[PDB]
Amino acid sequence: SITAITVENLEYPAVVTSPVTGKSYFLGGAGERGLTIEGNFIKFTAIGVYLEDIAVASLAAKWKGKSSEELLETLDFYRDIISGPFEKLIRGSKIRELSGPEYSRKVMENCVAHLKSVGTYGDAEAEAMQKFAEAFKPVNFPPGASVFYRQSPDGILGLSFSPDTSIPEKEAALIENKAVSSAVLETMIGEHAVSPDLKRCLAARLPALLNE
Numbered sequence: 372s373i374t375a376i377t378v379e380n381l382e383y384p385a386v387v388t389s390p391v392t393g394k395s396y397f398l399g400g401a402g403e404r405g406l407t408i409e410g411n412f413i414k415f416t417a418i419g420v421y422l423e424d425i426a427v428a429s430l431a432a433k434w435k436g437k438s439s440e441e442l443l444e445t446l447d448f449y450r451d452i453i454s455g456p457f458e459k460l461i462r463g464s465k466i467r468e469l470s471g472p473e474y475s476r477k478v479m480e481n482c483v484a485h486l487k488s489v490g491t492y493g494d495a496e497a498e499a500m501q502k503f504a505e506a507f508k509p510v511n512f513p514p515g516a517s518v519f520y521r522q523s524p525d526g527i528l529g530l531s532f533s534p535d536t537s538i539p540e541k542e543a544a545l546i547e548n549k550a551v552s553s554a555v556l557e558t559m560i561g562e563h564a565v566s567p568d569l570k571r572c573l574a575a576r577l578p579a580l581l582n583e
């Protein structure tokens with residue numbers, strides 16, 4: 372009973388398979404991100420977080436039997452999701468047109484803040500973030516265009532860009548850095564991620580799967 376989610380006409384299939392790793396994932400949750408301008412929420416993109424199918428078995432031990440309300444208030448739960456021994460696939464699909472530099476600027480800002488926050492922002496991470504930036508420079512995201520973050524548990528962040536919502540066959544870059552690899556997802560569902568839409572989806576959707 373793992374359904375699909377549609378955000379501003381941008382649909383997120385309940386399941387997807389990576390053309391890069393062959394692994395299959397289930398939709399953990401989908402929401403929206405944008406900017407608050409003059410007290411008004413201006414939507415810029417849709418975001419969906421996919422978890423490798425094996426995430427269920429991994430999370431089962433500690434979080435089966437827990438209620439959605441309980442999971443939602445438990446930071447540890449989200450930590451297991453963020454740093455769990457399974458691949459996470461994040462798909463951002465634009466609502467409003469953003470260039471690669473424009474979009475990446477905010478993402479990188481949050482990633483850097485997180486990294487410095489937890490004391491893991493050294494030269495290696497800075498270089499990884501520059502490589503991150505470089506990968507986005509030649510890209511533009513018109514409405515519907517997407518960015519795919521493949522978070523490998525092996526400490527690598529794969530970056531893919533699509534003209535639309537379809538997963539590209541090949542990745543544009545590989546950011547090989549452990550800290551940075553989870554930084555993106557951390558800024559989406561981590562403790563210091565204000566927006567709760569993705570967290571709420573995860574808390575609401577996981578219990579059913581964890582129970583069976």
Ligand SMILES: O=C1C[C@@H](c2ccc(O)cc2)Oc2cc(O)cc(O)c21
Nearest residue numbers: 404405415416473474477478481558
């Ligand atoms: O999906 C987005 C939107 C992005 C963004 C919003 C508005 C804008 O004008 C440019 C970029 O900021 C982010 C920053 C993050 O840490 C994680 C995210 O998932 C995102």
